[PDB]
Design a protein around this ligand. Structure first.
Ligand SMILES: Nc1ccn([C@@H]2O[C@H](COP(=O)(O)OP(=O)(O)OP(=O)(O)O)[C@@H](O)[C@H]2O)c(=O)n1
Ligand SMILES: [Mg+2]
Ligand SMILES: [Zn+2]
Ligand SMILES: [Zn+2]
Lengths: 50, 73, 149, 49, 49, 1358
DNA sequence: ACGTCCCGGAAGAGATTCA
DNA sequence: TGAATCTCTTCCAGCACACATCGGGACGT
RNA sequence: GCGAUGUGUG
């Protein structure tokens, strides 16, 4: 949904935003896994485990 | 169409005399009649001046000459 | 810990995915970084910044155009811009830039009419704020004048 | 700055000889200041406001 | 703000210096459609004439 | 219409001729009605009507009545502009001193009467007395008399003996003074006296008097009697929201003065008591002083609550007077502004521009075309139509845009690329789009910058915006020759990726038949973009004129690199792309393309670069990711070694063998070294990282690590920033010039504990603070420069002279930094350069060393060229063309008119500002480099020393006892390859003239100590070393021994201030060991704060460091410490200890010793030998009683004063000094500036001169007159059979050479106005236009370009 | 209320050091 | 007896925006 | 449609 510019990072020495991106991608991965386990109704024991 | 004036500068060595000659010719076209000497492509009077200069058929000499001629007339 | 969390998800360890170009449909070389970054809007909006003036009011003491956007003002062709024009060879641009476009009253009414008739040409006169500078230096004891040609 | 007393130095700049001075200021919370300072002649001079 | 799916890469220059490039999905889902409220006044005065 | 402006004083008769009536009533208007009070300040019968041709009474309201007056209110029915033009006057009761001429410092009144300004003020404020035309009594004339003395005198002398007090008394003294004899009397007194001070005083006073007589002025005009009031319109009364008028400062001041005047008029009709009339005169005086110039007296008045209200001197002075606020920078119609954005689909000569801004800007043109086509008859129909935006105006607007340039500008405009032109292209949206190859010039990132557009109205102006200011017409910077349309970041990355090669990609080594099917393979996807490949390419060349050899062959290349060859125009040779094409490579690509094919091919080629670069960059998709930042494994080891070393230095400081500053410097240096090692480790690890298999076994290569490319290609950042991301992030600088002694030892990929982050905060706040404040400094600098280097315009095609400065390559100790090609590219050779085959004249003596000639010079290996230079150009009022050399930003020679003054001043002062506002985003890092402690020669060669005075120490080495010693490495062909600065007391390995080879350390010293090495050998006695007063005597607890520390001025009291602690080498028998060949003892003065570690009576050999001096090196080496040095240079400040130079040449001798000075008498061969000079005998002379000096040689050492450089060695000497120094600064910060600009500033510096013998001319002997003037004068005097006028040139700093100018509107506009106006007034200094800033103030053409042609016409007519 | 007032840098000029 | 050097006083300290509040009280009819 | 202060931008 948005394209930023790589060349902006190692110049503007804020390496923080790259880790923010990765960790956000982790968070949303967990989010979509829950979304699937919840769309396919999954015997809430499964939700509980995950 | 016109992007660079380099040929005009080549035929008028100053690059300031370019401004002066071109402006004078453009007033001749815009205020008092005097249709151009190059097939205008709907470019404005300014580009037409620079273009005639690139054709090497206008410069301060020719302008003085033809003004003097018509004024005697 | 981030690697471990991603790997809990079904996502690649490096955090970089292969992406396909929307236009040509063919793969990108060298996988790129995607993720979800939390982004913010800022109240510096284009429709509060854009502004344009052709002819509006004029200041009262030195007949110059007002300044600002609320007041329908024009920009400030400032001192270093005057230096830039002097550094070029441009001189007619600077003359009309600080005589006709700005100050001299006879000048700019005649310019406006010359325009609306199709005849592009200036007739300078003298900057009114300069006339004011004369009036002030003259109101002191000093006597500034303008010698005959 | 906290109302009280401060023993400042103002080293270097003045007198162009590196001879530090030593000015003690009494800064009251409401009223008139008070300053003591030496001179390059080792004289103790007071000033007020 | 709101969290959006970003991907770091050059893309036909449309992000040359810093110029973020936004897909129309964002503007369609009205996820920055902020609201302002201006206050306009109008006074009425009785003066000479 | 008019010409030169005159200025003078104003008689009361003059003022009465100005005014149109008198002001009496201190009451402005009603604000119940809004008619103005009668004959108050905004009167009607005085300052004309209030409404157009509408009298105040009402009897007359018709144009028919133009000219007539009323008869009831009596107001001339005329236009209302007359209310701007008319002026009024006050009839002050008692005269009034004019605070300007009183307190201008110099006090014109003061050094007119020659009366101390203290006493004159005491008189003017009515608290003393002064005798005026005394009489034959005990008292003088100018004598002051206090209250009590006047009391006593009137007791005794009640005679005609007259004294008064106040302005009337000052006026009486003035009026009763006759100047026409005072001038001769004071000149006689000059002829009498001899003291320099008396001379200076009397000569300033005699200048004032003779000028005051030359002008048609009278001293009794400095004292006002009739004060004029400014018109009403120029001091308008503003209505706020309501029926209330917020305070207006001029009207306030006037009201106060009028009330005082009226009350004192009332007192002087009742024979009021003397104390009250005296108090009231003083009040009126103080009121007028406030009015003219508030605040120059004591407590300024205030009106709102507590802020000084604004007086006339403040309407003129300041950052907001009419000069710097409304006569140079004006607000302009037809303008607009918005936010910028990119849009890479643009040809580089055009810029997007939103529809609404266009329709709002070109409204008049639109009206014209509408009522020309006939779609609307009147103007109001047109206004309705363009406001409603009916769908015809968009076609109209296209036709009125098509070929009409508009000027884009970015806010902090610095160099003349800050304004460019573009043709518009209408866009949707509301953001100005800007081609990407121009952000390099505007310094405009798109993080929110705003740009302003202007429209050129007149026809000449459009032609200017097209032929001088277009975007295409500027593809070379005017500072350095190198291009300024360099592709910046995404495109350089795209290229660095498109032209490279991995070892085994697809399509390895298959032959291709041309760039076309190279592209076709890459697009079909049968071969990776870069795998090396043999292709037939057909390259052209132009070996003859307009010739194009078409040679074709099978190069070895990489697929992508050929795809790039599809673009390059014909002329360029194929070896231009076969490299990897970083940023430097692509820049010089454009540079060669320009030089070889002119312009249009290069513009079209820059467009093609941008397009194809963006394309293949997108195709790469070079993303950065966390994994792509690799941590080394030498880091932990290097850090542990560094901490071991700081621990050892801590232990030694615990043992007291070293002082605090010394330990500090040791710690900081080992941290810098460890920083370097870590950076090298990481950078090697990144670069060669990728080891990949070949179809053999394995092979290494240059990596494709994303951050490595982003740092190698040269897109953004540098080794500093990638260092902070991978290695340790080094040290941190305080906001001032300090470095913390606790370096951060971690990088962003790793965490930071809280303390490390806190230190990083120290650093970053340095960054910000310095940006703001040093920005202020640099801006002020450029202002000063462009106001001394303004009135300078190329004016003649050839001066016709032969002076020329010398040019040599500059070397620092490593690679030659700026070689001869770079220095003498494009400059007219003064004197023909002989091929080193002597008498084979290689280039004639007026050629323009363009690139071909530079290659010839480089081949034939010349290391000295004498070339013409502006500083020695013999043209009147300007600089001839050739002497200025090659123009920049264009290939050909300079034109006739291009105002080099301003472009030079900008290109000097710019990178000071631009770097300032950028110095932060390196971070807080510390740009610090060690002294290297030794000179490690690099290549086989010979040795050559300059200015060595060495001595052979005990251990058989050679130490250097001379200050400026300069070492040089010569090669095996004679060429000079290396030059080093060998500091004092260093140890040479080899002597002079000995063949050394590479890696042979020749020098070795201690980088934190200036030793005091001797030259003789014997025992040591402390001379004049008393405890407690001068020295201090510490003791080592551990070794039980002691040591001396010698104190500076900061602690010694009067008990030792008159002493000099010094070592003195005796022999074994208590006698003065004399230095060989001399008669002066071997005494060695110790400077302040010096460590003496020895003992007394010790035997020591020649060359042993008797005393150490902690060196105290500065903190940091960025552009926050350089620029003040530039200010110092261009100001010409005398440094602290000016090394005295030898005035006249000849042999030397001493003289008679004073208490603490010493005579030095230099006797020439035959001439005026008695020249002497006193030398403070604590200064260690560098010449001995027997030897000989030549003018310009030194006597002591240290700094070197430009004033003396000028008056001794020569203009070429001083200019080479200034240019080398300022280039040293700007190169240490890595900034390209061609030298011509610094030389033209130097010219404008040294331009005044002083007479010595007027001869047959008309110059006062001690007069200071501008050099061009005296030159034309004595030039024509020589053209006749007379004697010239000997003169000596002075070197004023810039902020003085701009004030002491012939014009005065320039000066008035620059940096103060009170002084300039008062001086110009009392002299009646008539000013012509003659320059640029004058003509701009007054608002007409500028004798710069097009204006220069016009002024040819005008000066021809007159 | 209506109306009518109340900090580096430098250059001048003490003044102190040579005699 | 005069020429250095210490004291105090004037004058300057980057550019262009955008927006906000706020504009003097004190007494005879 | 004036000047002050203030906050914030490039
Ligand atoms: N007192 C200031 C502050 C900023 N600027 C302008 O702001 C630019 C710097 O913009 P900035 O965004 O602050 O730094 P950049 O490195 O350009 O961009 P970024 O901060 O995102 O790294 C400077 O070139 C200058 O034009 C200025 O002129 N004067
Ligand atoms: Mg920025
Ligand atoms: Zn009337
Ligand atoms: Zn010349």
């Amino acid at each position: 949904d948005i394209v930023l510019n790589p060349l902006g990072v190692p110049s503007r020495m804020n390496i923080g935003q790259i880790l923010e991106t990765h960790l956000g991608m982790a968070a949303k991965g967990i989010g979509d896994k829950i979304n699937a386990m919840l769309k396919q109704q999954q015997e809430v024991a499964k939700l509980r485990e995950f | 169409a016109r992007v660079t004036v380099q040929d005009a500068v080549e035929k008028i060595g100053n690059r300031f005399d370019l401004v002066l000659v071109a402006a004078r010719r453009a007033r001749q076209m815009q205020v008092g009649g005097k249709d151009p000497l190059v097939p205008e492509e709907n470019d404005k009077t300014t580009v037409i001046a620079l273009r005639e200069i690139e054709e090497g058929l206008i410069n301060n000499q020719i302008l003085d000459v033809r003004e003097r001629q018509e004024q005697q007339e | 810990e981030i690697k471990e969390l991603l790997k809990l998800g079904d996502l690649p360890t490096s955090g970089q995915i292969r992406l396909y170009d929307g236009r040509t449909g063919e793969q990108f070389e060298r996988p790129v970084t995607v993720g979800y970054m939390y982004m913010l809007k800022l109240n510096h909006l284009v429709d509060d910044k854009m502004h344009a003036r052709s002819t509006g009011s004029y200041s009262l003491v030195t007949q110059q155009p007002l300044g600002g956007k609320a007041q329908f003002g024009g920009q400030r062709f400032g001192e270093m811009e005057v230096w830039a024009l002097e550094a070029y060879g441009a001189a007619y641009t600077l003359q009309e830039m600080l005589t006709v476009k700005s100050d001299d009253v006879n000048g700019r009414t005649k310019m406006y009419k010359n325009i609306v008739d199709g005849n592009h040409q200036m007739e300078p006169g003298m900057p009114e704020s300069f006339n004011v500078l004369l009036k002030e230096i003259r109101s002191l004891g000093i006597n500034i004048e303008l010698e005959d040609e | 700055r906290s109302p009280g007393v401060f023993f400042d130095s103002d080293k270097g700049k003045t007198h162009s000889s590196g001879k530090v001075l030593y000015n003690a200021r009494i800064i009251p919370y409401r009223g008139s200041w008070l300053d003591f300072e030496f001179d390059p002649k080792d004289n103790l001079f007071v000033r007020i406001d | 703000g709101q969290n959006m799916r970003v991907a770091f890469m050059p893309w036909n220059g449309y992000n040359f210096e810093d110029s973020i490039l936004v897909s129309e999905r964002v503007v369609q889902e009205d996820r920055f459609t902020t609201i302002h409220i201006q206050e306009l006044a109008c006074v009425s005065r009785d003066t000479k004439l | 219409e008019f010409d030169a402006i005159k200025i003078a004083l104003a008689s009361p008769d003059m003022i009465r001729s100005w005014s149109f009536g008198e002001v009496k009533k201190p009451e402005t208007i009603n604000y119940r009605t809004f008619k103005p009070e009668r004959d108050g300040l905004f009167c009607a019968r005085i300052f004309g009507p209030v409404k157009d041709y509408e009298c105040l009474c009402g009897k007359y309201k018709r144009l028919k009545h133009r000219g007539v007056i009323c008869e009831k209110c009596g107001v001339e029915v005329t236009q209302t502009k007359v209310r701007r033009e008319r002026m009024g006057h006050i009839e002050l009761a008692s005269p009034t001193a004019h605070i300007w001429f009183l307190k201008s410092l110099p006090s014109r009144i003061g050094l007119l009467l020659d009366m101390p300004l203290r006493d004159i003020e005491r008189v003017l404020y009515f608290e003393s007395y002064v005798v005026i035309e005394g009489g034959m009594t005990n008292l003088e004339r100018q004598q002051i008399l206090t209250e009590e003395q006047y009391l006593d005198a009137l007791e005794e002398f009640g005679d005609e003996f007259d004294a008064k007090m106040g302005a009337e008394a000052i006026q009486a003294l003035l009026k009763s003074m006759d100047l026409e004899q005072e001038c001769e009397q004071l000149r006689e007194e000059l002829n009498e006296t001899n003291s320099e001070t008396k001379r200076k005083k009397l000569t300033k006073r005699i200048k004032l008097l003779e000028a005051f007589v030359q002008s048609g002025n009278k001293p009794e005009w400095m004292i006002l009697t009739v004060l004029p009031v400014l018109p009403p319109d120029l001091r308008p009364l503003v209505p706020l929201d309501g029926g209330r008028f917020a305070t207006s400062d001029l009207n306030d001041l006037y009201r106060r003065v009028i009330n005082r005047n009226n009350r004192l008029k009332r007192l002087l009709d009742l024979a009021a008591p003397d104390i009250i009339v005296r108090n009231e005169k003083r009040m009126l005086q103080e009121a007028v002083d406030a009015l003219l110039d508030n605040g120059r007296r004591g407590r300024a008045i205030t009106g709102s609550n507590k802020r000084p209200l604004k007086s006339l001197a403040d309407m003129i002075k300041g950052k907001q007077g009419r000069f710097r606020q409304n006569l140079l920078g004006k607000r302009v119609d037809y303008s607009g502004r918005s936010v910028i954005t990119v849009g890479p689909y643009l040809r580089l000569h055009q810029c997007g521009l939103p529809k609404k801004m266009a329709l709002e800007l070109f409204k008049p043109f639109i009206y014209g075309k509408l009522e020309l086509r006939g779609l609307a008859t009147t103007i109001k129909a047109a206004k309705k139509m363009v406001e409603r935006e009916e769908a015809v105006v968009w076609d109209i607007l296209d036709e009125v845009i098509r070929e009409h340039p508009v000027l884009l500008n970015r806010a902090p405009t610095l160099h003349r690329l800050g304004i460019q032109a573009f043709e518009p292209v209408l866009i949707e949206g509301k953001a100005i789009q800007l081609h990407p190859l121009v952000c390099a010039a505007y310094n405009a990132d798109f993080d929110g910058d705003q740009m302003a557009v202007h429209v050129p109205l007149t026809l000449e102006a459009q032609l200017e915006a097209r032929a001088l200011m277009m975007s295409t017409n500027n593809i070379l910077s005017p500072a350095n020759g190198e291009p300024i349309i360099v592709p910046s970041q995404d495109v350089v990355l795209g290229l660095y990726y498109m032209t490279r090669d991995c070892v085994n990609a697809k399509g390895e080594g298959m032959v291709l038949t041309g760039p076309k099917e190279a592209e076709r393979l890459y697009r079909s996807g049968l071969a990776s973009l870069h795998a090396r490949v043999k292709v037939r390419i057909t390259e052209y060349e132009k070996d003859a004129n307009g010739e194009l050899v078409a040679k074709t062959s099978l190069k070895d290349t990489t697929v992508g690199r050929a795809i790039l060859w599809m673009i390059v125009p014909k002329g360029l040779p194929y070896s231009i792309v076969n490299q990897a094409l970083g940023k430097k490579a692509i820049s010089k690509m454009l540079n060669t393309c320009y030089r070889i094919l002119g312009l249009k091919p290069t513009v079209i080629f820059a467009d093609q670069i941008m397009y194809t670069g963006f394309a293949y960059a997108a195709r790469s998709g070079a993303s950065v990711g966390i994994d792509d930042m690799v941590i080394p494994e030498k880091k932990h080891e290097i850090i542990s070694e560094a901490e071991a070393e700081v621990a050892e230095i801590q232990e030694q400081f615990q043992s007291g063998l070293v002082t605090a500053g010394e330990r500090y410097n040791k710690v900081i240096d080992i941290w810098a070294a460890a920083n370097d090692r870590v950076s090298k480790a990481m950078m090697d690890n990144l670069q060669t990282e990728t080891v990949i298999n070949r179809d053999g076994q394995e092979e290494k290569q240059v990596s494709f690590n994303s951050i490595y490319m982003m740092a190698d290609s040269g897109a953004r950042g540098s080794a500093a920033q990638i260092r902070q991301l991978a290695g340790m992030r080094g040290l941190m600088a305080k906001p001032d010039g300090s470095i913390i002694e606790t370096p951060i030892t971690a990088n962003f990929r790793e965490g930071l504990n809280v303390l490390q982050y806190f230190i990083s905060t120290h650093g970053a706040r340095k960054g910000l603070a310095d940006t703001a404040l040093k920005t202020a400094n640099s801006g002020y600098l450029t202002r000063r420069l462009v106001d001394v280097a303004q009135d300078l315009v190329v004016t003649e095609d050839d001066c016709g002279t032969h002076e020329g400065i010398m040019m040599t390559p500059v070397i620092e100790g490593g690679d030659v930094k700026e070689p001869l090609r770079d220095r003498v590219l494009g400059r007219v050779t003064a004197e023909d350069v002989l091929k080193p085959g002597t008498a084979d004249i290689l280039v004639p003596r007026n050629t323009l060393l363009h690139e071909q000639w530079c290659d010839l010079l480089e081949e034939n290996s010349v290391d000295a060229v004498k070339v013409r230079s502006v500083v020695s150009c013999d043209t009147d009022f300007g600089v001839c063309a050739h002497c200025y050399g090659r123009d920049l930003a264009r290939g050909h020679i300079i034109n006739k008119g291009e105002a080099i003054g301003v472009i030079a001043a900008q290109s000097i002062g710019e990178p000071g500002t631009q770097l300032t506002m950028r110095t932060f985003h390196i971070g807080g890092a510390a740009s610090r480099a060690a002294a290297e402690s030794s000179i490690q020669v690099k290549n086989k060669g010979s040795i050559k020393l300059s200015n060595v005075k060495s001595v052979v120490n005990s251990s058989g080495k050679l130490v250097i006892t001379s200050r400026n010693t300069e070492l040089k490495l010569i090669d095996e062909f004679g060429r000079t390859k290396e030059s080093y600065k060998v500091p004092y007391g260093a140890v040479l390995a080899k002597g002079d003239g000995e063949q050394v080879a590479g890696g042979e350390t020749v020098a070795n010293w201690d980088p934190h100590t200036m030793p005091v090495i001797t030259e003789v050998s014997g025992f040591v006695r402390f001379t004049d070393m008393i405890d407690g007063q001068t020295i201090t005597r510490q003791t080592d607890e551990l070794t039980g021994l002691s040591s001396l520390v010698v104190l500076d001025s900061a602690e010694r009291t009067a008990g030792g201030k008159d002493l000099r602690p010094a070592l003195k080498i005796v022999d074994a028998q208590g006698n003065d060991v004399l230095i060989p060949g001399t008669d002066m003892p071997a005494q060695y003065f110790l400077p302040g704060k010096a460590i003496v570690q020895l003992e007394d009576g010790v035997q020591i050999s020649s060359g042993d460091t008797l005393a150490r001096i902690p060196q105290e090196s500065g903190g940091t080496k960025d552009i926050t410490g350089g620029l003040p040095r530039v200010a110092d240079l261009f100001e010409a400040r005398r440094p602290k200890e000016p090394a005295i130079l030898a005035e006249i040449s000849g042999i030397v001798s001493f003289g008679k010793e004073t208490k603490g000075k010493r005579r030095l008498v230099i006797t020439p061969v035959d001439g005026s030998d008695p020249y002497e000079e006193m030398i403070p005998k604590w200064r260690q002379l560098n010449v001995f009683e027997g030897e000989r000096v030549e003018r310009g040689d030194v006597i002591s050492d240290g700094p070197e004063a430009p004033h003396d450089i000028l008056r001794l060695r020569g203009v070429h000497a001083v200019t080479r000094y200034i240019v080398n120094e300022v280039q040293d600064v700007y190169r240490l910060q890595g900034v390209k500036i061609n030298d011509k600009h610094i030389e033209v500033i130097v010219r404008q510096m040294l331009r005044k001169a002083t007479i010595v013998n007027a001869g047959s001319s008309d110059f006062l002997e001690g007069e200071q007159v501008e050099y061009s003037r005296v030159k034309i004068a004595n030039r024509e005097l020589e053209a006749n059979g007379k004697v010239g006028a000997t003169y000596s040139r002075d070197l004023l700093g810039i902020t003085k050479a701009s004030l002491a100018t012939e014009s005065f509107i320039s000066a008035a506009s620059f940096q103060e106005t009170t002084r300039v106006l008062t001086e110009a007034a009392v002299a009646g200094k008539r000013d012509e236009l003659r320059g640029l800033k004058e003509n701009v103030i007054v608002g007409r053409l500028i004798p710069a370009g097009t204006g220069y042609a016009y002024h040819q016409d005008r000066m021809r007519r007159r």
